[model samples]
Target: KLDIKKTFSNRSDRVKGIDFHPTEPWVLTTLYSGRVEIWNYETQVEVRSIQVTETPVRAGKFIARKNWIIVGSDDFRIRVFNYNTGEKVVDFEAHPDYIRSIAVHPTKPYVLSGSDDLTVKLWNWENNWALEQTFEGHEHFVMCVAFNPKDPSTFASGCLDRTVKVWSLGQSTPNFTLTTGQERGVNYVDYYPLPDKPYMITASDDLTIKIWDYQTKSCVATLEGHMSNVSFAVFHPTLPIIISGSEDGTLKIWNSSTYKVEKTLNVGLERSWCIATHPTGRKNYIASGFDNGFTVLSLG
Candidate 1:
């Protein structure tokens, strides 16, 4: 059963991304209108709004334990904001084309970014967000970048080139590429929370979500439920389940072990652009972004 908790509207433009704080009851959302807002779910109110750019704000997230937020914009730059003060602390031209995704290292002072320029760049945030390294392999736009939760030194990037490449800290090349053996651009990629298992999940424009065994670099499972493009997919932080949002205007929850669809929620929007689950426990709460607004619901 799913219960409506609250609905928040930002602008007439589509909401592009949603991210939950690692341990807080706060969610950060990005809109195509180039605004980023921090919502305090506990109080059911927006706590802060940062005017990031005139162009779209594609991606934004709270750095695990900081008062800072990292956001990527359609203006081809990444900006860091002091969430507590709503001050833009730092900003830089990150890519030639628009910045599509950004991920922070679990325990390091590093940040990873993927862009339409088809390159993944690693930045040393501790060194004033210095460009420390770059990884180039995707032949098309790089769509998503995610850090392995357990391995701070490793991260993965998905691209319009139809490939997911895993890279190590200092390596110039990817450790391996995970392919679907088919054609479709990957919109999102995520690493399973457990370090020992080393599995990855991906959402594709082909209307499917896939599980890959990074060790073998092979697809172990395929989930087919979305009718339109599967825009975003993510594993629950503490549960054996997967949550996905699609352009079909629905959010589906799946049993990770059995690969079965558990529940589907019709969000009644043009597209459910992004979904973010609560990070604290098994509350089964999720925030979904859509055209013109976003909603917080209980997935119990």
Candidate 2:
């Protein structure tokens, strides 16, 4: 059974993103009102509150082993801050349009970002945080980007153009594109944890989650269940479990090995937009963010 362990509310607007700390018992949440809150899951109390922007904080994540956080905003910039100290470290204009997503390399000093300007850029933080390269191929706004956990040199971008592009470090363009059969925009993309298989999963406005072999550029399976646009999807760290949230106000867990729905949680009174799995290897908890509020679910 899935039990609703803890629910977080008292927000002014919809929650835009949710990310778990790599090793700590913490979770970070960003809202449309531009407030970012870090909560200690063990105590179920908010530990830090960051009010760095007035414009929407679109996405954010904890850098793998760092005490800092990287946040993307609708003001077209990316800001890195020490959440513990409230000291801003890196602040730079990231795109011509709003920054939609931000990702840090799992093992390197590289940062990958996507924007509504229809471009993806890579930056090297180790070398003065220099802008390394820019990749342009998407015909519409780039919505999400994710680095492979097992292969840091590789990453993928999902765009409003209804395509997912795979990129390598040495290439200026995407190595390949995985076109979802439906022409709707791809909202989110995530890599399976296994290094040997090298597969990707994407959620879209077409109300489906698709598993693809990025190397072969083919759809291996499609998970169809959501009644509305599937807004976000993610893979569990240690299990063959996939979780997804939708505008239909529900979250679904799928067994990746069998490609079947395992459980569903009705989370939002309105529309749910974001979902995240805890990253500390517990594989027992998940967080879902929505228009009305956000909820924490424990697999029991």
Candidate 3:
């Protein structure tokens, strides 16, 4: 059974993002009202809270590789803050439009970000966080970007144009574009954990989650069951499952091997926008963000 590890932050503001600390028991939730709250999962207490921006902070994740938290907001900017001190380290405009998501490269000093401006940007920390290169091809808002764990040099981007672009680093265009075969936007994309590198997942407005073979750029399987738009979905960190949330206010767990729904939890009265887990399977956490707040779950 999948157990409710902890449900958190039943606040008035909508939750835009959810993330977990790399090694610590901390989990993060960013609100549409611009509040970024960090909680200790073990203690069930708020550890730190930062007002990241006046506008909605849509995405934020622990750049634990650098002991930092990188946040992106509707202000069209990205800010890096030292996690311990809560001190702003780096701040800069990242996109011409609102920033949608941020993905940090696994073993490099690089960050990949997507924006409403129909572009993805690569930023380098070793180069003092310089704009390393620009990735442009999407004809609509770039919604999400994530690096493949086994091969950090290449990544994927999902866009409103209903396509997921598999990108090769240092290249100006996509290596492959996997069409969603749906009329609606592809909201999020993610690769499964390493040791199984070929399969990737994408959640979309069409209310389905798909598994794709990235190397061959082919759709291997499609998961169906959600009642509304599936905003986000992810493979369990260390278990035989995948978790997905939707505008229908439900969270479903899929058998990772079978690719079928194994369990479901109706989290909020409103839509869920993001789902996060401890990448690299360091810890088994499924942190999901919904309209009012967020919830943390664990395999039991």
Best by TM-score: 3
Q: Assess the local accuracy of residue 290 in candidate 1 as a C-alpha lDDT between 0 and 100.
A: 91
Candidate 3 RMSD to the real structure: 1.6
lDDT per residue, candidate 1, 1-300, as tens digits? 444444343444788878888676778999898988888777777888877888999988788676899999889999998888887879999988988888877678888889889999998878988999989888998888988877768889988888899899899989888776537889999888876677899899999899998888878889998999998899987677888999898888888889999888886777888777776543667788898688776555
Write down the RMSD of all candidates, one decimal each: 2.0, 1.9, 1.6
Question: What is candidate 3's lDDT per residue for 1-60, written digit by digit as tens?
Answer: 665555444554788988888788888888899889888877789888999888999998
Clashes of each: 0, 0, 0
- The TM-score, computed over Cα atoms with residue i paired to residue i, of candidate 1 is 0.93
Model 3 scores a C-alpha lDDT of 0.85
lDDT of every predicted structure (CA atoms)? 0.83, 0.83, 0.85
Q: What lDDT does candidate 2 reach at residue 287? A: 80
Error of 1 at 118 (Å): 0.4
The TM-scores of all predictions, comma-separated, are 0.93, 0.93, 0.95
Error of 2 at 207 (Å): 1.1
Candidate 2 RMSD to the real structure: 1.9
